[PDB]
A = this chain, B = another copy of it.
Amino acid sequence: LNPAVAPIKSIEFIPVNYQSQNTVVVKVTDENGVYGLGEADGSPDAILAYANIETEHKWLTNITEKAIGRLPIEINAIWDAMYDATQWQGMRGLGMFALSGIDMALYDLAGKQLGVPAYQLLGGTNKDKVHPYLTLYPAIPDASLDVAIKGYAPLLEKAKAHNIRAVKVCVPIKADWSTKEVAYYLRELRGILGHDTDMMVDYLYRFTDWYEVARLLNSIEDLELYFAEATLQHDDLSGHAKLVENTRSRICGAEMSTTRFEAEEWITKGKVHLLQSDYNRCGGLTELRRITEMATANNVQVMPHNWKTGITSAAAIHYQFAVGNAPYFEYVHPEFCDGELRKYLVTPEAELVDGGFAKPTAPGLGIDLNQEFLASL
């Protein structure tokens, strides 16, 4: 057998704060010193504590215990083991963020051992390139319609200049615009962007009444927006079904969810067009694979939520090549987003050429920490 396939020796959770952007790097190392990198969402110190709890019983075990000593190649089996041993407090919520980080690191570690890029461990690909949609947000107050539009105007011009195939814009949380003003706002941005680029919208959960949201969405149908994200409260699945039944917009769901079980509910009860389960929240690449194959059979697209560091971004590219079932996937690019962690935490940076990425050639996720940057916090 392949000697490089060695059992996991250790797994450490490494908080990384930068003055308030942060993440929790997950490092899994085998007995030969080779290691994989992943990252978990959630308050770094809460995640670190959870990752260091004492095992108490069958359903309340330390998350890393079931992985240490196992062969990194058995990613599916290791996932089941960790999940089963942590049911008392990790079936949903924060605990799943920790499991995600480990699952992610395993694809990077397994890739290095076998000498293959992570997407080849996920089924391989028939695509020659993938194209992300970029989430854009200017450094604005929440501001006024004028400030917001002026702040977006250039990011949108820059996107078109770079031939980005799709972009997502947001409605400022603290903004107090009426739905009539939101429509105007979106019309103005779409006016700036043009119709050759797909445009997604994140309403940041500013609504609670499906009826009002339906009136808004049905009034801007002419804008041919790609989707409507975070319209109603995340727990309001029946409310989302109402939107699907009464509008012609693509309705998204599950951005903050965890596991395929919550994903299944969004599909059947929420009737949503697209799931946004996050790499570093819902159960990693392994759970996103099950979620996506289930989604496909149900005519539901999956565009995993993504706004962390270069670690998740790398996982995102690999996901899109072997698992993705949609035209785009969420990605945060350094030239279209402020944030040092995203910018320098890991290297190298995937090269975006004409709005797309080429197939990964390096082992695993093809990334490593920028010791220099990390050396300074």
Binding site for B on A (CB under 8 A): 1-3, 5, 20, 41-43, 45-46, 48-50, 52-54, 56, 58-60, 70-71, 73-78, 80-81, 87-97, 114-117, 120, 122-126, 173, 209-211, 214-215, 224, 234-236, 238-239, 242, 246, 248, 250, 256, 258-259, 261, 264-265, 273, 290, 293-294, 297-299, 301, 322, 326-327, 361-363
Contacts and interface: CB of A to CB of B under 8 A. Distances in A.
Contacts of A49: 43, 45-46, 48-50
A73 B73 CA distance: 13
A43 B362 CA distance: 39
Given A43-B60, A123-B74, A115 B5 contact: yes
How many copies of this chain does one complex carry? 4
Contacts of A265: 265
8 contacts: A2-B115, A20-B54, A45-B49, A49-B50, A75-B124, A93-B93, A215-B224, A265-B265
B293 A120 contact: no
Contacts of A58: 173
Contacts of A246: 248
Closest 10 CB pairs of A and B: A74-B124, A93-B93, A76-B123, A2-B115, A49-B49, A77-B124, A92-B92, A43-B53, A92-B93, A46-B50
B250 A114 contact: no
A250 B214 CA distance: 12
